[PDB]
């Protein structure tokens, strides 16, 4: 139910992971080390976050697993863009890891990704994305992936959840008081951006799967696991 759902999402927000720039100047290696060490740690907290979304843990294990494998980079990115929204030309990875767009030139393949994240972040800024809309949109990213039946009432339980979160977003948007027509346009403007997020995610995933092939960076633990696929 929308007010309570939104409060839950609010209270579910994972902590900021703190990381710092290396002492020495960035190299392609040490930059990817920093961003993957960050991502790995944020993955750990993404799991706890997902478990706090009402109904998530009532889904079958395979369903929880597969939504998470499907959306994790999207969710890392969505949280990154939200942290960066008020800082044009920068990506706020952590309070002490603030990358200028040009620093992406340090790693082959990464500048484009930064540019996509930066443009999506500018689009959110232009729309004046509100904190409560960002909460619903992030939870929608988790809940809105293709499932196509696996071979293992969970899928019905998923639909009900995504419904509730979409309702919660429509309800958040109704608070602005704008015209019916403009409330529709805003919903569409927000949701159309889900594609950009998925598109950047895909480019991020492939970047990391390629780096992992080049041993351009060793990856560990949770991140390694998620990438192994």
């Amino acid at each position: 139910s929308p007010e309570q759902l939104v409060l839950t999402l609010l209270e579910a927000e994972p902590p900021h992971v703190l990381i710092s720039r290396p002492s020495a100047p960035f190299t392609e290696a040490s930059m990817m080390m920093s961003l993957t060490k960050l991502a790995d740690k944020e993955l750990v907290h993404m799991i706890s976050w997902a478990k706090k979304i009402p109904g998530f843990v009532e889904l079958s294990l395979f369903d929880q697993v597969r939504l998470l494998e499907s959306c994790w980079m999207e969710v890392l990115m969505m949280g990154l863009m939200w942290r960066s929204i008020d800082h044009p030309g920068k990506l706020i990875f952590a309070p002490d890891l603030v990358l200028d767009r040009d620093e992406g030139k340090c790693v082959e393949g990464i500048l484009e990704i930064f540019d996509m994240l930066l443009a999506t972040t500018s689009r959110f800024r232009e729309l004046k994305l509100q904190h409560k809309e960002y909460l619903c949109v992030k939870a929608m990213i988790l809940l809105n992936s293709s499932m196509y039946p696996l071979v293992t009432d969970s899928s019905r339980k998923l639909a009900h959840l995504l419904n509730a979160v979409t309702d919660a977003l429509v309800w958040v948007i109704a608070k602005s008081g704008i015209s019916s027509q403009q409330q529709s346009m805003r919903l569409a403007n927000l949701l159309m951006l889900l594609s950009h997020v998925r598109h950047a995610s895909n480019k991020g995933m492939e970047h990391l799967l390629n780096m992992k092939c080049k041993n351009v960076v060793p990856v560990y633990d949770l991140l390694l696991e998620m990438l192994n696929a």
Partner: peptide, 10 residues
């Protein structure tokens, strides 16, 4: 396979 994910979900 989701050797550690299973772990943290359960």
């Amino acid at each position: 396979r989701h050797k550690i994910l299973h772990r943290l979900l359960q």
